[PDB]
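Appendix B. Extra example for self-study. Work through it before the problem class; the solution is given directly after the inputs so you can check yourself.
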Amino acid sequence: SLSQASADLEATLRHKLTVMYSQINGASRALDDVRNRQQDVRMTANRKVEQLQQEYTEMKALLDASETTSTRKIKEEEKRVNSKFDTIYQILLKKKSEIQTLKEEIEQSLTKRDEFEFLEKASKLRGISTKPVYIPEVELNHKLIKGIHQSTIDLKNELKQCIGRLQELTP
Amino acid sequence: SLSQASADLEATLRHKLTVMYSQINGASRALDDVRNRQQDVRMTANRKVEQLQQEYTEMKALLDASETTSTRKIKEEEKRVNSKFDTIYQILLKKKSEIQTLKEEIEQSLTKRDEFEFLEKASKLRGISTKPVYIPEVELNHKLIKGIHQSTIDLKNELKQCIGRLQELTP
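Solution. Structure tokens for the complete assembly:
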């Protein structure tokens, strides 16, 4: 009968309802999975960025170590040179004081010169002959210093080249 | 006479005095000159140190530029992927709502199932057919990302090598 065709239609539609209910749950599950997958993508990315930052921090530590070393070599050269000059300064003080002493001896005999015995006493002073001072050349190691500067420039340009090539790998 | 030998000695000794006075002035001017040369050495040294610091400051600027570039590339990959997922989320919402709409239409006709005209009205609904939803394949470029990481490590070890060579060039 038509009551049978109608109860049949009802059964069909309710079965459809249960199927579509499960398919909707499927779509919900999928929406969640999508947002989750996105957040996992983000986390992965940030992790990699943080690793990069680690490598660059080490690279900067290397640069600092180098710069400190080179700086030390330069200040050592300066130190060596200015020490030589220090020695020289001492030597000059010693010469000056010596000459000043002979000067005062002479002036002495000249003050008590009208005594008869002036000739007897001062002819020995006729002898002493003093020299003028000079300053030895002291030369800073220009080749060492210019070598360091230049090589540091070289290092920079090598680094520039390397970076260029890296970024090149990733156009 | 001995008065002549004495006036002679006097002339000699006084000449010596003036010479020694000049030589002493010489030694003072020489001490100052030495101090000048030392100051010049220091200035040269500090100058060179400042130049070094310049090159290292530029090298750090280069590292920063690179790191920023690489970071950007990684974030670009992340953004590409999460955009695809956003599009997918929209598509999924649309499918879900579509199935949900058919579901509510069916449920509606079922609220009128005890009406005589139910069979007439709902057989068309017997038509309805819906499918399950899925997420398509979408993956992060792991080769690109790991390649950037690895190449950055490479860069670090190259730089390390170069620095080593520089410092060994100035032994």
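Self-check: The radius of gyration of chain A is 48 Å. If your reasoning did not lead you there, revisit section 3.
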